[PDB]
RNA sequence: GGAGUAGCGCAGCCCGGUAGCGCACCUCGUUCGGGACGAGGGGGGCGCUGGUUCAGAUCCAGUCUCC
């Protein structure tokens, strides 16, 4: 047996690694996967980190409805125009037909704006600090396990603010708490930066991205954050009475992670072996493998369990892998594909100097003393962190690359990132994607100020920096 | 304030401190609420509990999906024949009309059916411990905020298992969760038992349940743990080969816990003065109201952000009331609303004297030295629980009755629980309903083993003991 | 033009006989330091609908699907 190396196919090893690795499998219907607990548990982990996150800067969860009318869709004209396509509509329930459609939420803005309308009132009841978990419905043609899928879990943050400035700061801050969970918890390197207007969200003024780059060279865009303005405040009637007595509209934001987090990390760092999981957000980090004879079992397995109360106690993520119908051979392999940081193997041999063998997902063994094993893992877990970064990161770069002719262009958007300038016109990115397939990712904030002529038509150059280009998810 | 008393109209008192007390709303939708800050703030710690005592009994999470094919839900008879009037159907996705309509899920034991068909193989692959915390819908005629809503989100518990035994078992194990988390946690007694042919669950062989009394009278159903047998490996080819050659279907079991389990809370502790919350799952277990004028609003809030920290290193949910636009009698009422266990007050004349007043919920009022309450707390809050509990006991007692005769019983299901012989046949049951609206909670495990005539019928007494009967919600 | 046959991957169809092989899975034993070995087993009725025939994955007709 095997797996599809990257090179050969990567789309075949993504779903096939998420198969073997039981990170999840195909669901009956369309478009849809069913989480298998290994995978479930990634997602836990992402959402104990942010929803922390969140909770230190302010935001309290609540729950909204599945089911929106159909008529609240409509209230905004940009949001609905873009949904409306990819809706799945409950038409029959209870056994008669409905007086008006249900749909099933795609996002929750409107009945957020609905409920808001009658909760604010004065300055008192801002800001509105509100973040939601849950699934939601988007019937899109052509889905990927976790990338993009029929129905998907996430995390949904809506805020009202009192003033235009708040809620700015407040769509950064968040965008700043994706890109931290990114890369101090994921070891995924990403791009901070502003989607042009072609690619921001149906209802939004401006939207604000994290984008990385998988290791097939291809760009996945893995949270957004947007400044709503007063769009769904005027479309809602959310209005409030300021301290100068004056009645004004909110300004609303929004921002959401979904499960295609996952993918982000399995496209970043997996290889040909299979997965790896970054330490921080990884169900199992430490697994023991006993190895032993019929003769050697009882001691062996005792010694294992013992490192397991050991390394349980330095708060680590341990798993003893007792199973007998299989050999050390065959598990050695099991947990690689699950992408396990660290293994430590316990054999007699091991026992007998009162040491172990640790080998690493990333590559080499060691041997350590038993005892110096459990004070010694959390510090080369976070190693074992660093390196999967700066891997990550070298990867970027040796992907990332300034173009000026559009010939160098075609040429850089088929390895990864290409760093252009353009006119800033729709019509202009549009006749790039048909000719090229790549698109706008984002206009870097940090990105260096430059002026220059757009790369396809000639124009003089927008945003006052090249933009980022390539082939996205 | 107007807060109906609960002598005058229990439903009205109820829907008014869900409202007032900020728990919940209702949403644009018919039979849906939308659960505020405060409210969902419960149902996460209750999520808390029950998961880390699911977890400790090996079940793992995971996530199947909200759309089932129709089909399904026939495969399987008793169990579509139960749910098919309260379905919710998607038939329009995406922009055109699906091949086969897809039912929102009500329950999810067909579609974890079909994949747990796909998945085991041998009996190494068993037991299956499964659990998934999401959203369900169930188009249900007369609807109640938590107790019963159109959407509602809940813990459903599955598992498949190689032997009837090791099913049954886990049946019990579950439910006394369940029961744990009500008595331990909620303060809220219940009775552990077996609901009879006519109330259990569509396609359940037998239905384990936990009741509950209302301050109301009426008894409420908090939690249920189905035996499936083999109804849904038959339905759905789930089988295996066991350690004998011989190849047989899994038994499966079923358990969830809505949040009808706030309702609950809500209506066995509130008082005519509002909510009265455990101090085990109360979001805030200690507010801290300074008291103060200009001239001393420095040292009283110094105090008490002092004694916020304080509290927050024993660990305890405090909650500091600042608000400089509110008088402390104001405060004082919000929080005795909203059912917080203790609020301490900290005034001017408190700083010289190093002592403070705390006030519990439940009558008590004492003065304590500030350096004593952070220790003195955590016991104190233990003594509430107890109260609590203690109180709930000797509500139910008291509204409870062994009857022997029909009219007795007519007249005990009017004031809480009626302990009746009956003959056990659906027919004479659904007789009781229709003449006294009475129906049967649950054929108690713990109940004393006693013979006698239907208290309806006077045919011979089934079960062995007397029936639980009550008007339920 | 090829192809739909066991969970996966395939052979069998020409020259009909009541379905087979690899992997997986069950049993037993031998194994166990980089995906073990042997023997014994369990599971499908061949995409679907006709037809010919004692008998149809196999022959005939037609319909659905993937490349
Ligand atoms: N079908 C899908 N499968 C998986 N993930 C998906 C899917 N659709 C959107 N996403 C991802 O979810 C995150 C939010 O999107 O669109 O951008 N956005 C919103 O929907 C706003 C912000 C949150 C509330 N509403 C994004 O980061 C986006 O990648
Ligand atoms: N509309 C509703 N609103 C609120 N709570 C509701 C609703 N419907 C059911 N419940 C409550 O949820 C718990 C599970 O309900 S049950 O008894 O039908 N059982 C089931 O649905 C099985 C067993 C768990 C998984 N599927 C029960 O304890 C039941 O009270
Ligand atoms: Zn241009
Ligand atoms: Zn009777």
């Given at each position: ?16 690694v998420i198969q073997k690795a039981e990170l999840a499998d195909y669901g009956?219907?369309?478009?849809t996967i069913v989480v298998r607990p290994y995978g479930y548990a990634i997602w836990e ?100 396990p976790f ?112 499960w295609?987090?996952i ?12 997965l ?7 169900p ?54 699950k ?135």
């Amino acid at each position: 047996k095997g797996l599809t190396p990257q090179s050969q196919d990567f789309s075949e090893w993504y779903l096939e690694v998420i198969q073997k690795a039981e990170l999840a499998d195909y669901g009956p219907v369309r478009g849809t996967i069913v989480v298998r607990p290994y995978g479930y548990a990634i997602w836990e982990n992402i959402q104990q980190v942010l929803d922390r996150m969140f909770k230190e800067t302010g935001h309290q969860n609540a729950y909204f409805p599945l089911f929106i009318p159909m008529s609240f869709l409509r209230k905004e004209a940009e949001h609905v125009e873009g949904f409306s396509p990819e809706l799945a509509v409950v038409t029959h329930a209870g056994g008669e037909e409905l007086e008006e459609p249900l749909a099933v939420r795609p996002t929750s803005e409107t009945v957020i704006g609905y409920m808001w309308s009658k909760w604010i009132r004065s300055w008192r009841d801002l800001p509105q600090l509100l973040n939601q978990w849950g699934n939601v419905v988007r019937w899109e043609m052509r889905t990927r396990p976790f990338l993009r899928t029929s129905e998907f879990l996430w995390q949904e943050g809506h805020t009202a603010h009192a003033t235009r400035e708040e809620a700015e700061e407040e769509v950064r801050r968040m965008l700043s708490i994706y890109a931290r969970l990114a890369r101090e918890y994921a070891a995924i390197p990403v791009i901070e930066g502003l989607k042009t207007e072609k690619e921001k969200f149906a209802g939004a003024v401006y939207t604000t991205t994290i984008e990385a780059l998988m290791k097939d060279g291809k760009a996945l865009q893995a949270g957004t954050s947007h400044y709503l303005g007063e769009n769904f405040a005027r479309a809602f009637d959310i209005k409030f009475q300021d301290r100068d007595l004056q009645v004004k509209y909110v300004h609303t934001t929004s921002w959401g992670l979904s499960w295609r987090f996952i993918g982000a990390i399995i496209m970043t760092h997996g290889d040909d072996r299979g997965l790896v999981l970054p330490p921080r957000l990884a169900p199992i980090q430490v697994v023991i493998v006993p190895i032993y004879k019929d003769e050697s079992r009882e001691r062996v397995l005792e010694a294992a369990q013992g490192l397991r109360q050991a390394l349980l106690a330095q708060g680590l993520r341990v798993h003893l892998d007792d199973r007998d119908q299989h050999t050390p051979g065959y598990k050695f392999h099991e947990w690689e594909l699950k992408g396990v940081p660290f293994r430590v193997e316990l054999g007699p041999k091991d026992l007998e100097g009162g040491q172990a063998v640790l080998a690493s997902r990333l590559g080499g063994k060691e041997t350590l003393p038993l005892a110096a094993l459990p004070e010694a893992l959390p510090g080369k877990l976070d190693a074992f962190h660093e390196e999967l970064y700066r891997r990550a990161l070298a990867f970027r770069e040796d992907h990332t690359r300034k173009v000026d002719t559009y010939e160098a262009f075609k040429e850089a958007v088929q390895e990864g990132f290409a760093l252009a300038f353009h006119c800033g016109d729709k019509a202009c990115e549009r006749l790039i994607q048909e000719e090229t397939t790549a698109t706008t990712r984002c206009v870097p904030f940090e990105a260096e100020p430059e002026e220059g002529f757009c790369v396809r038509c000639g124009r003089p150059s927008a945003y006052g920096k090249r933009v980022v280009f390539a082939k996205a998810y």
